[PDB]
């Protein structure tokens, strides 16, 4: 039971990664950070880091309510307790753990903090799972298993500030991380119909007895356990895909 | 696989080609066409659908309850029509039938004055007579208590009923209480896709044997708020944000971009266990029922049914021996449907890749002049050489050759055969189904019994149900209930007995049954004198004009 | 005249009766536009 | 031609100048009891009495409206008979009444 | 409509000539059976909307 | 497509109606409600008024499906077989009528 | 089986017509009894065995 | 449902209106009633379904 | 025939206003049955079918 | 070829502690067995559904 517990949830840990991967790939609308023009511009040295601000997160909602897409939650008007904020956010936005530091450090148009804290509207609200804060017009998530493009930016040299990096063939190379928001009714898992739906796991096995016995092991001391399923993407609106990418601190 | 040959789709669909056709005829369908609406029929040939007799003498009263109130219940809380076509059509196409059995019921307080009595001791002989007055009337007619004795001699007759002085009753003023109002108290049965429900695989082809079932259904927060004692732990289980209904393994019809903007009315999958399990550690099993939605375990209890069993109810179409699952016809069935399909493809190739209304016309037969003559429909003249009587040609369909209908025709015999069902023969099985009614002497061909098989197979479903609504009803309804349904005095059965079927005895009601039923009692009537015992005869009139529904016939009847 | 509709799509309540909890119009427009995917796929059948 | 008409028939059921005499036999006391059909009547029999279901809905809730709407006066001049009064609890639940088509 | 138990046959009388009534006066019941029966062949699914 | 009654009082237009259920009082108990609205006004809103207290909706089906609501005629059986009688038809005319007489 | 009772049945009511009705009542009583038993009523034939 | 045309029968362009399907000539030569061959199912022998 | 048996409903209704009594008592010869105004509008009391 | 002249008669059947439990006196030494595991595997003898 403890081989087929392992077993299991390497299963389900394989098909999120896959599923999450695609949707990466797959993304219409793409923000890049800084003032790069692709994966190779991408660097955190020099004068301009690409690193996002509060200007990117507010075109990003411009082209998104330009686009049409839908919203997924409704502003919050706080309660009466003492230190507790109206916060106007809108949509989720997905985020891994190693952004989370510089969006907490970040700042508005006047100079004042831009990442308010669950703690402040918890009363009066409802904290989805794995929600972090809220910026502008988004709500952040965390998701552990969020997965990055490792050596894509620009080489890394001695002016590194501290920005995270990853070794390629023997030269050093800038990560590059997501921030990704699934709009409503964007894609679909597809799947067949006799014996294999979208996301079922058919699971076999054959103990050793006489079952497993044939002419090649005539008494038969073996076994074997398998697990398989189907998978498939399909993308209905790609514009509501969207995506920004960026650098992350050490 | 069976329902897709049924359907024609997957693997019996015919291959795609560009130049040829892709015509399927439907054989297992038609086999299941006629089947159906054979089986349905004796469920809906009358009003009453259960029928119940009592075992010993003391059972007629309990019997004459069961059946009225189980009648009210599936005449008024269902639609009788569509579960009966629904129970029967999954059997025949599926191969086995799972019956989920359960009970709902929804409870709201309410605020209403109850006006406040004083009691006064009985005076003169006016208030004993208006007393004995308002007893006659409860024991006559429960309604008529109800509705016009007023509110004050109710009181003093529940004082009465209490204790055994009488007094007389004068009110005071009004006082605000809180009264709980039952809207829904009646059982539900619903039909369970068989991809849901998963039962233990070592019960060696016995329901009883088995030792759990799980079952996974869609359901609301509305719905596990209705009792808000037996569920715990609602905060965790999210119901603002996911919205989309994707669980893999569940298998519905819902379709898959709807989802309601409501919290409340959204729609979460959640999982029941229904088993045995041994609580106390000491080697007893006991019944027991969990659920869970996603990683949160929200109820646990023991089994609150007073049978003790599984609800749920399971029927074989055609039996494999010591096994749970049946077959359906499709087994049989899907050669002779694929070879059929061939035949009858291969005929509309042939007549339609044919050229049909082209003509052909020789080289050198006429001229230009006397072509274009010819060509726009008047008389012309030929070079007598050829003779246009034979060389005109005027193609036309080939002749089909005998032996794609030879071919056919021997699937068609081979497929009647096996199975037992013909296109426009059969179905006066229903007829004949009750024991009294025409199963005594009853002659039927031999394709006939292979029906009443299966309807059999059906009516010990149906009387397993009856069962468990029954065992349900004895404990969940209250008294008042009953009364207001049938209009009798009530009558206890006690909690003991219930484990084991005592006293009452369920099956299916027919047209049929009760017209000799009715015939044997009128010959009884004649084999007795008439004149042995009034007593006698009358309940035998009373018992006659029951079963050909005139209530007020009978009740003059009995009191008389 | 009199400004523009005073509701987003009648969010919020519009005040028609006393119920602590009122519907208002997104809402029930909302399971509308929900609901009718299927109802249009449905009906290519019936056509 | 023919043998598409006549897989036609076998599926459907319908046959040109056969049938129809179903609904004469739909009573139960009027020809339930002993009714022998041949096996294209009792599919017609079954889609009747869905139909006859759906009348009997029907007919209920017309009643149930009626219990309320309809005064008195209305009611004792379309009937010429003394009232009959329903209590407001037993609206919800069909007590008492039974309906079907005649 | 028939009665369930023996104090209803003035109930059920009373509602079988109202009801009766209503369907012959306030109907055209040809026109109505036509649709309904026309409907229910036709689609494969009638609704009845009451009011 | 063309048609409009000058009267403004006599003029047709398209109304919605909402018959449901509705946590009126936020308690977690479902009541049934109805709603009308045109356009993007709404003008009634109050709680269903017959007193069977259901959407007052009678379907039947005439070949009913398993498990689900709707029905299906009899059109899905006989689409191809009307497709091939009608080719056989059309075929035998223009054999006939093509040929000169 | 179904017919096994009807023709029990019959040999019952031939032996109470063989069998004057009035030669003996607690033999009459009992052929009476036993035939109501095979007919599936069991109050009347416990009603006429204790009479 | 093969169609197998002789060699010779039609030139280029009354081939091509053949197979486009309309009005042709033919060589008197070859006659287009029996040359031209559309195969059927073969005939089942009486010996089988004897068996 | 429903058809008819509104024509007669319709004529009957205009017959209760428009004649007079003596040309009824003239056709009939028998004393005249009244109707109020009032139940006119509802059809009660009566039904109309062909012979 | 008579059972009843058979001297003894052997059966194998599937069971759990629960059911034996059920009759505590009637069985001895159960403690014995290893409940753990000891599953159908073992037996090539005994033919069953079970998986």
């Known amino acids: 039971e403890h081989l087929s517990r392992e077993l299991m949830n390497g299963a389900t840990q394989i098909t999120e990664a896959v599923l999450q991967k695609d949707l990466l790939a797959a993304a219409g609308t793409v923000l890049y950070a800084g003032a790069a023009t692709s994966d190779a511009t991408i660097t955190g040295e020099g004068s301009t880091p690409s690193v996002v601000s509060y200007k990117n997160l507010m075109r990003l909602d411009q082209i998104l309510t330009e686009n049409r897409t839908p919203t997924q939650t409704t502003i919050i008007t706080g309660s009466r307790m003492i230190d507790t904020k109206v916060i106007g956010a809108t949509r989720v936005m997905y985020v891994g753990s190693e952004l989370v530091p510089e969006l907490k450090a970040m700042k508005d148009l006047f100079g004042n903090k831009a990442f308010i804290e669950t703690q402040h509207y918890a009363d009066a609200g409802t904290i989805m799972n794995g929600e972090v804060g809220s910026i502008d017009k988004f709500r952040i998530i965390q998701v552990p298993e969020m997965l990055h493009w490792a050596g894509a930016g620009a080489q890394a040299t001695g002016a590194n500030p501290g920005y995270r990096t990853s070794m390629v063939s023997g030269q050093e190379h800038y990560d590059v991380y997501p921030m990704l928001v699934v709009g409503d009714d964007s894609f679909t898992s597809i799947g067949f119909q006799t014996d294999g739906k979208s996301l079922k796991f058919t699971v076999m096995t054959k103990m050793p007895g006489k079952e497993t016995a044939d002419r090649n092991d005539p008494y038969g001391e073996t076994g074997f356990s398998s697990i398989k399923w189907y998978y498939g993407i399909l993308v209905k609106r790609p514009e509501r895909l969207a995506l920004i990418k960026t650098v992350a601190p050490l | 696989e069976w329902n897709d040959l049924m359907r024609i789709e997957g693997k019996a669909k015919p291959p795609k080609v560009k130049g040829r056709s892709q015509v399927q005829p439907k054989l297992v369908r038609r086999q299941a066409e006629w089947r159906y609406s054979a089986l349905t029929e004796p469920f809906l040939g009358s009003n009453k659908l259960f029928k119940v007799t009592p075992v010993t003498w003391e059972d007629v009263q309990g019997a004459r309850q069961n059946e009225l109130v189980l009648n009210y219940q599936f005449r008024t809380k269902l639609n009788r029509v569509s579960f009966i076509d629904n129970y029967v059509r999954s059997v025949v196409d599926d191969g086995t039938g799972i019956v989920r059995v359960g009970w709902n019921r929804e409870i709201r307080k309410e605020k209403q004055e109850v006006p406040v009595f004083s009691l006064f001791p009985i005076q003169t002989q006016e208030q004993a007579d208006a007393l004995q007055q308002a007893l006659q009337l409860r024991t006559d007619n429960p309604r008529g208590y109800e509705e016009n004795v007023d509110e004050a001699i109710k009181e003093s007759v529940r004082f009465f009923d209490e204790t055994g002085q009488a007094t007389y009753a004068v009110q005071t003023g009004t006082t605000t209480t809180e009264v709980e109002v039952p809207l829904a108290n009646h059982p539900t049965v619903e039909m369970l896709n068989p991809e849901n429900i998963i039962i233990d695989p070592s019960c060696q082809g016995d329901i009883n044997k088995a030792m759990f079932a799980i079952v996974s259904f869609e359901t609301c927060k509305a719905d596990l708020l209705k009792e808000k004692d037996r569920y715990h732990n609602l905060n965790k289980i999210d119901w603002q944000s996911s919205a989309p209904v994707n669980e893999p393994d569940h298998a519905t019809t819902t379709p898959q971009e709807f989802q309601i903007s409501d919290p409340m009315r959204k729609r979460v999958v959640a999982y029941e266990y229904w088993g045995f399990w041994d609580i106390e550690g000491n080697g007893v099993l006991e019944p027991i029922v969990a659920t869970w939605i996603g990683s949160t375990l929200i109820r646990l209890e023991k089994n609150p049914y007073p049978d003790g069993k599984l609800p749920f109810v399971l029927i074989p179409y055609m039996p494999v021996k010591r096994d749970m699952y049946g077959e359906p016809d499709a087994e049989l069935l899907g050669d002779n449907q694929a070879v059929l399909g061939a035949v009858m493809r291969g005929m509309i190739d042939l007549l339609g890749r044919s050229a049909n209304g082209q003509r052909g016309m020789p080289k050198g037969m006429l001229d230009a002049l006397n072509s274009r003559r010819y060509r726009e429909g008047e008389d012309y003249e030929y070079n007598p050489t050829q003779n246009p009587a034979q060389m005109i040609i005027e193609h036309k369909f080939p002749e089909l050759p005998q032996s794609a209908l030879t071919m056919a025709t021997l699937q068609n015999q081979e497929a009647e055969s096996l199975t037992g069902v013909k296109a426009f023969a059969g179905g006066v099985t229903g007829e004949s189904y009750g024991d009294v009614a025409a199963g005594i002497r009853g002659v039927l061909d031999a394709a006939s019994k292979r029906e009443m098989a299966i309807l059999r197979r059906l009516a010990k479903g149906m009387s397993e149900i009856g069962n468990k609504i029954i065992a349900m009803n004895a404990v969940f309804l209250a008294e008042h209930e009953v009364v207001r349904i049938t209009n009798e005095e009530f009558v206890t059965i006690k909690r003991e007995d219930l484990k084991g079927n005592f006293d009452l005895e369920v099956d299916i009601s027919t047209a049929e049954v009760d017209n000799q039923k009715s015939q044997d009692l009128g010959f009884m009537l004649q084999t007795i004198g008439p004149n042995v015992d009034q007593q006698i005869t009358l309940n035998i009139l009373a018992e006659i004009a029951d079963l050909k529904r005139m209530p007020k016939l009978a009740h003059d009847l009995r009191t008389w | ?47």
């Open chain 3, 1 to 47: 005249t009199d400004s523009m509709v005073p509701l987003p799509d009648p969010s919020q309540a519009t005040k028609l009766t006393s119920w602590k909890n009122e519907l208002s119009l997104q809402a029930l427009k909302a399971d509308l536009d929900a609901a009718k995917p299927s109802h249009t796929a449905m009906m290519i059948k019936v056509k």
